[PDB]
Amino acid sequence: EDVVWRWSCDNGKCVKLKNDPRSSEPALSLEACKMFCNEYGLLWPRPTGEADLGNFLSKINLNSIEVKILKKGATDDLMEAAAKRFKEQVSLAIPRGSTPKLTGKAVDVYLVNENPNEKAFSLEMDESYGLRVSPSGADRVNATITANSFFGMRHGLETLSQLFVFDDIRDHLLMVRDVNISDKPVYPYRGILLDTARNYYSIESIKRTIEAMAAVKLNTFHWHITDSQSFPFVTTKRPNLYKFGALSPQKVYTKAAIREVVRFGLERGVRVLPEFDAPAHVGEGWQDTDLTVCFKAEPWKSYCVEPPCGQLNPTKDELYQYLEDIYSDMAEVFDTTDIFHMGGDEVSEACWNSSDSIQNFMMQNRWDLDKESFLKLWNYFQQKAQDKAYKAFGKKLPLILWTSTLTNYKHIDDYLNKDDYIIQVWTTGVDPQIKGLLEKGYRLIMSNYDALYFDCGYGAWVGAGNNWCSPYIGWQKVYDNSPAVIALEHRDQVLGGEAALWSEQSDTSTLDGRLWPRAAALAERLWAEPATSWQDAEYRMLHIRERLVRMGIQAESLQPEWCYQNEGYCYS
Amino acid sequence: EDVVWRWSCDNGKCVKLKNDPRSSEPALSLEACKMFCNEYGLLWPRPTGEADLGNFLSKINLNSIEVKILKKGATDDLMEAAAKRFKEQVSLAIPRGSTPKLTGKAVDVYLVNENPNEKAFSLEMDESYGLRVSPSGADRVNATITANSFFGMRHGLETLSQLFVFDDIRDHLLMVRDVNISDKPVYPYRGILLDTARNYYSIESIKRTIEAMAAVKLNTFHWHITDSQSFPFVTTKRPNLYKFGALSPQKVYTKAAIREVVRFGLERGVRVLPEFDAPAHVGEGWQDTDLTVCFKAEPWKSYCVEPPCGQLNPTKDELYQYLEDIYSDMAEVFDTTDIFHMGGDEVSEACWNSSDSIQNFMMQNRWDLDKESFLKLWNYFQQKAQDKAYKAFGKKLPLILWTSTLTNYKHIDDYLNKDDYIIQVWTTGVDPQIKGLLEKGYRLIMSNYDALYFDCGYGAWVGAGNNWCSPYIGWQKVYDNSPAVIALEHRDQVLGGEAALWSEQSDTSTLDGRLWPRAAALAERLWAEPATSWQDAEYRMLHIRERLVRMGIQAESLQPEWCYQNEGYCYS
């Protein structure tokens, strides 16, 4: 039947009131009230420059939206695909099973790409855009997006699609009448790390993730594609790695599958960045090569962070022929990435010290087993691995490693340099290492485990109780975690941040809930770096969740829907 | 391509080994090894009586399974539907995208229902069955299920479907050759509470939940259909409650929808038990009746447990005309239930004391505002409400209330009696109230919040931090929570238990993850009450999770799949 309520803006809150028949005042639907009652309406993330939404809405004919590309170039296929995708994005305003009346104004969307040949990902890429909406003649609307690149342009199409509201009282599709928006991201790297080796993720679910990412202007999918537990990456040059390493023959990522994901990402402004974690976090797949040590070592607690144990043996020269092949196969299909992630997860010293061949190698090279020594070995490995990586990608490109014993700012310069290596940070924002690194000129990606480890909070997967980094991190906590606060003056060295979904307790089935809507909080934090806190974003956060659900994302629930319909009554 | 591994049983663990070509030993697939390496094979829950799985498997033709019903009766439609459903259940053994070779033995399933007219739910219903599998002739199998009722019979079909394994090495569907099982549940009430008022749940997702419940022999769906936040229940007699109370016009449960859910439940041995929570937990829907007090009272912290505040006014005699109508409408569509839940959630004293009409009522009746008084009012309400409930269902039937101030064992006998009221327990298993109640003869349903509140662990929904009953409860903790331990000698008074999914932070999108596989732990605990702990159920728990995923349930992930393939290496 019929919606019986209406909403009215009062002190920044949409108040639910009965829609009494004996009134000369036109009733506002919930979303229509929200669009103007809220500082930023229904936008997520909120823009950084001009945020002028005006005061009024106009009724729109859903069938009379036409997109026009004004400057042609090398990104024609991308712009054309992005344009075709736009009506789908608009239809997200309409709840499922509801149908809008096909009446109202016609919409002309004008796409102005000022450098139509650019399609490369880079930390220096221009993601800026200008959005202007205004009436055109008597029966139409002029929506004009102006951007320095395709990437800024498709961001603009995303923001534009958010300026449509469905009036479920009247069954009208509406649109903000007078818009002036100018927008650019604070940070160039806005990412999600997806571990697809601790458990497998269907490529369908990976694509779905990219869709949700594009919806909130996240631009980097970090594909942690290998680890101790499995090797799903299809390497044509070393096929036994995935034949022996995959969880099953179907649980693999073929060249065709990866090319699909990479293209799907590109179309949506998402860089697909591969990781080969080494020399720790290796195991399954390497059987019969004699290139690992400690695989399945027992008791595991003595040799590694989590079962199964296993590490590369850096004293075998054949190892680097394998790596060269793995990296080359990666470079072939991950062909949009401008960066390579090489892991650098904490190496076990006990694991390396328990191998004869390694101990013999260190005797001949004048190194003792004192642990300045084992750091020497790790550096020896990384240097050789690095060399292979460059050969594989056919150029010097930036490389990422995690904060670890190797990347301790005190000695980091012995090994790496700040121009060649970006450091991904898992430590808390108040850890000394961050200041130490930033002073030495290093660039950072923030993944502090107290605010950005999206796996935290669930039951133990070894023994009983809860998992190691519990409690569960609410979106409030991810929203307030500010790299600018963490880095201070050195904030230009912060490239951005990344929500990490480690997968010992996540797979295809849990992926939507794990990431959404929490990764949206990161999305806004990194796009806008607002000085305001989470409570000022709360109402819009509740709307973005509903939007993901409309997309078919099984997003986590934040609050009773009653709270969304009754702003201000749910507080503490 | 091809599976490259095989598994071999060693000290109760299936060990992954290379499937070397130069062997005279036939390779075992992972599930085939598990079927005999494990004490109870792939069964969940494990049977209570005979659990003889034998030693061997037989290859089965998936197209040559035929079910025969030997004793006809009033449950013909149910038995026929249950039988038709059986091949689907068997196909769950096969992973998606895999196809079994259509060769092997033919299967004759013989269903012996010894009381073919019985189809009523009751605490005294007989859920027992006997399962025997043995070879029949040379080319077929005799599967015979013998049960005292339809309900025991469909339980038997569930267990039988679990005796099929897919050999992904050979692409063979297999089945345990020689089976002798006798089985009956320890507790008659094995339940899930689903709150569909704090957020709405699509009826599709409710049916899906029932499917997963049937899969592990849970028999009671407690439908917490109303609360302060919304009134989705379609009451024909008082239509303004749902017209004003629903979150939207589509977010309702029509008579047709509820009849569908109730029938779907019946076919699967699931009792759909409605709750009308009163006199607290009321709000939306009651506008313009003047039958509530404190609705949206501010500051909410002074008047209720969570916003919005609101309670029934028990001093209005019209109230009981409304309740009579609500209960009657409920009784019409919830026509399989033998029990009614009346809530009895903690009433606010401050809320009742802030009403003039209530204070005037208590003056005239010689009661002071001292709180012995307000307990008198609550009792006055419950007595009148109870009377309406009996009229509605057209018989005296057992009623459930929660542990509360009203049901404190010290004074409970002033108000209720142990024959008319069952008490649902949210307190911890070591709370004095449990012993106190059990000694007074009361029957209990266990929902201890430290082990059975499936909503615990996530972010705050008011303010920041985590929700009230955090941390998140792992399946380990729900498995080990034993009513028999909690109740001791009085354990026959424990009717069972219930996993509670409160929905301030759960809806359609999160429901599968919230409930599964954790509610399976409760399922085994209540069906078998094993003396062993969670670690003895671990391997089978990991399999049941995979089974739910095969059903299309987006179950939580417990552990890396690597752990499932490598029993014994993941421990603490």
UniProtKB/Swiss-Prot annotation, chains A, B:
The keyword Nuclease does not apply. The record marks 306, 468 as: Essential for chitooligosaccharide substrate binding. GO terms for biological process: chitin catabolic process; glycosaminoglycan metabolic process; polysaccharide catabolic process. Its EC number is 3.2.1.52. InterPro entries: Beta_hexosaminidase_sua/sub (IPR025705), Glyco_hydro_20_cat (IPR015883), Glycoside_hydrolase_SF (IPR017853), Hex-like_dom2 (IPR029018), HEX_eukaryotic_N (IPR029019). Keywords: Carbohydrate metabolism, Chitin degradation, Disulfide bond, Glycoprotein, Glycosidase, Hydrolase, Polysaccharide degradation, Signal. Optimum temperature is 30 degrees Celsius. Stable up to 40 degrees Celsius. The active site is at 227 (charge relay system), 281 (charge relay system), 346 (charge relay system). Changing residue 411 to A: 1389-fold decrease in catalytic activity with 4MU-beta-GlcNAc as substrate. The record marks 305 as: Important determinant of glycosidic bond specificity. It catalyses: Hydrolysis of terminal non-reducing N-acetyl-D-hexosamine residues in N-acetyl-beta-D-hexosaminides. Disruption phenotype: RNA interference of this gene does not cause any visible changes in phenotype in larvae before pupation. At the pupation stage, 20% of the larvae show abnormal phenotypes. They fail to shed their old cuticles completely before starting to form new ones underneath. Pfam families: Glyco_hydro_20 (PF00728), Glycohydro_20b2 (PF14845). Belongs to the glycosyl hydrolase 20 family. Homodimer. This is Chitooligosaccharidolytic beta-N-acetylglucosaminidase. It comes from Ostrinia furnacalis (Asian corn borer). The lineage of its organism: Eukaryota, Metazoa, Ecdysozoa, Arthropoda, Hexapoda.
